[PDB]
Amino acid sequence: SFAKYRWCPNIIGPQSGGAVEDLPVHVFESMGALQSKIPTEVLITDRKEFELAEEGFIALTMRKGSD
């Protein structure tokens, strides 16, 4: 955010500067299907992230199915 606008309020946007892109993915074989290892260790839901937001945490929800 600082390399683009020379400030930093822009850290909380999936399309506005809070999107950690280009994560490593590892496509492996599951029990029958072909899935991908989630690059963050849990899939944070929207209610879980809002409950972490009220309790003072900077959570990283992962775009399920991509990098």
Partner 1 sequence: GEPVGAIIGNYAFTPSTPDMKLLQYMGALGAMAHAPFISSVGPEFFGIDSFEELPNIKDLKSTFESP
Partner 2 sequence: NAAFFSANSIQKPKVFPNTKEGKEAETNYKLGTQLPYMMIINRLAHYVKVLQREQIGAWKERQDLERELNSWIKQYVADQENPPADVRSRRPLRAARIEVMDVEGNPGWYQVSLSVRPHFKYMGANFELSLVGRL
- Phi, psi (rounded to 5 degrees) for 59: -90, 155
What whole-number distance in Å separates Cα of residue 67 and Cα of residue 42?
A: 14
Place of tokens 């400030």: 7
CB neighbourhood size of 59 (10 A):
14
Contact with partner 1 (CB under 8 A) among 24, 32, 56, 65: 65
5-24: contacts with partner 2 (CB under 8 A): 5-7, 9-10, 12-18
For residue 66, the partner it binds in partner 1, partner 2, none, with Cβ less than 5 to 8 A by kind, is none
For residue 32, the partner it binds in partner 1, partner 2, none, with Cβ less than 5 to 8 A by kind, is none
Kindly list the residues in this chain that would bind partner 2 in the complex (CB under 8 A). Answer: 4-7, 9-10, 12-18
